[PDB]
């Protein structure tokens, strides 16, 4: 929150805080209409900007905010994790029920798309990748990987049953291991950041 003087340069009007700078901007206790953030403190400063008409005193005040994750957890991170688990539970069904596991995979993909659509409408339209975007991308990758693994198992059926059985038992445990590793690394790098 930068304020200064319009029309009065530094040689005419200077600003200063009336009390100690740490005690001049005072936020009330019940003065918080924040729903998504958390006010941590304030920070004032004073400086000079050089414009086309002269030097002007500018008083700066920074309010430090931290976004609360409780909404986005229940909104995006819990449905995505539950949807990937719903994709990974397909590995326990028998290889003789092909419409069952196909409908699992494809409806899980539908669920991931509607989740990504509902979750993309929350964030403003930035032109880069956020952490939630990376999470949704990796979860979509895991879901798609589950469906392609099912396709490999189904395609390898009726020609080599042992290879299909081996890769479905190995991929029945490799998917939760990799998803847990991704979760550990992601939450560690974005909670200690």
């Amino acid at each position, epitope marked *: 929150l930068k304020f200064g003087s319009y029309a009065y340069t530094r040689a005419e009007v*200077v600003y*200063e*805080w009336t009390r*100690e*700078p*740490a*005690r001049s901007v005072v936020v009330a206790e019940d003065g918080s209409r924040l729903n998504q953030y958390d006010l941590l403190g304030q*920070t*004032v*400063d*004073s*400086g000079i900007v050089q414009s086309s008409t002269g030097e002007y005193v500018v008083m*700066t005040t920074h309010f430090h905010l931290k976004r609360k994750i409780g909404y986005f957890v229940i909104q995006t991170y819990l449905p995505c994790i539950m949807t990937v688990i719903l994709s990974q539970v397909s590995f326990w069904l028998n290889r003789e029920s092909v419409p069952a596991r196909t409908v699992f995979g494809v409806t899980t993909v539908l669920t991931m798309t509607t989740l990504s659509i509902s979750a993309r409408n929350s964030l403003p339209k930035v032109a880069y990748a956020t952490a939630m975007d990376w999470f949704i991308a990796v979860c979509y990758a895991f879901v798609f990987s589950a469906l392609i693994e099912f396709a490999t198992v189904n395609y390898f059926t009726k020609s080599q049953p042992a290879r299909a059985a081996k890769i479905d038992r190995l991929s029945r445990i490799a998917f939760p291991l990799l998803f847990g590793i991704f979760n550990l690394v992601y939450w560690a790098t974005y909670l200690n950041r």
Partner: antibody
Amino acid sequence: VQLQQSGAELVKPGASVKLSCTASGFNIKDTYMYWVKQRPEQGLEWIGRIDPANGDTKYDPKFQGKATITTDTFSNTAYLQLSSLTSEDTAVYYCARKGLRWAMDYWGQGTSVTVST
Amino acid sequence: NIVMTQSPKSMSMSVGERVTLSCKASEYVGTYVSWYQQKPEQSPKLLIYGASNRYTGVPDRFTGSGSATDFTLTIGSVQAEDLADYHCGQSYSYPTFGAGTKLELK
């Protein structure tokens, strides 16, 4: 413009002293007035400040209860009274006023309190 | 209580050479760090008010450099009257000064 302090004092440990700082060249109701202490061959220590236009005072946690700062506007004077002085606060006591970017631009002349027998 | 640590506590230096003094704050002090000069048995004189602003009557050889926590005071062509103490003090909160730095001649 100018701050004038009193002369040195030689008091006995356990009594009270009152130091004065008289301002010449400005009205003390426009700025804050600071009291600083400096021991021989050491760094400065902020005692407290007073807002003479209001009367609000703030003190250093290592001086709360010991020192008390008052002001008299009619003669442009700031007073510092120390209550119970022990055998270590033999320092120089400076009187300062706030400046442009909350600095102490004008200082006094120093008042050397001394406790002995 | 924001603590200002000044370094070094004592230094020696010759005539006509650049010198840099440093002041580090524990908490945030925006640009409200001031540099005072104190000769023995005299009152301190304000040299640099705020981070990088010279006071009226200070030569153009003193210059300050500011940040959120790290502050420096640089003297250029150092003359023979700078045999004094230099204190850094913060004014973001209730004022606290540094320990002091004694410039010497050798």
